């Protein structure tokens, strides 16, 4: 929000867990203690489109994201062209 879908979980470990999703997610930002110690929910999200490929894999244990962003550029949908 403008890209606000929560995939968070609690492990935020990313080995045999989740990577998939065009650019958007440059994480591994180890918070001071969370097991395989890499955490949070995103990096700078003003770049790419609206997947839920975002979970599909590696837990969000609650929801999982999808489209919810509304304010929606174009670069933010393939088609501005």
């Amino acid at each position: 929000m403008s890209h606000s879908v929560k995939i968070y979980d609690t492990c935020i470990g990313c080995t045999q867990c989740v990577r998939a999703c065009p650019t958007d997610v440059l994480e591994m930002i180890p918070w001071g203690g969370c097991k395989a110690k890499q955490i949070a929910s995103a990096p700078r999200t003003e770049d790419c489109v609206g997947c839920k490929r975002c979970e599909s894999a590696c837990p969000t244990d609650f929801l999982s994201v999808r489209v919810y962003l509304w304010h929606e550029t174009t670069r933010s949908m393939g088609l501005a062209y």
Partner: protein, 73 residues
């Protein structure tokens, strides 16, 4: 359509169908001011409906009348 169509298929051939103009003479430069797209993923659940409905409600409309009027009853 709206109802068994689902934005994906529509948008994509509009991706090919907006390679026309841009690539065809006597219809170049000629700019849209709104970027050709396919209907939102809630919007068309509505529109098929708000469409399903008039048809439907405009059919009994004309059905009953068109036969309670003649009759015989």
């Amino acid at each position: 359509m709206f109802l068994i169509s689902w934005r994906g298929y529509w948008q994509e051939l509009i991706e090919t169908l907006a390679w026309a103009h841009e690539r065809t003479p006597l219809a170049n430069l000629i700019r849209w001011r709104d970027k050709p797209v396919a209907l939102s993923i809630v919007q068309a659940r509505l529109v098929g409906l708000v469409h399903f409905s008039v048809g439907y409600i405009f059919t009994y409309a004309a059905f009953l009348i068109a036969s309670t009027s003649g009759k015989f009853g």
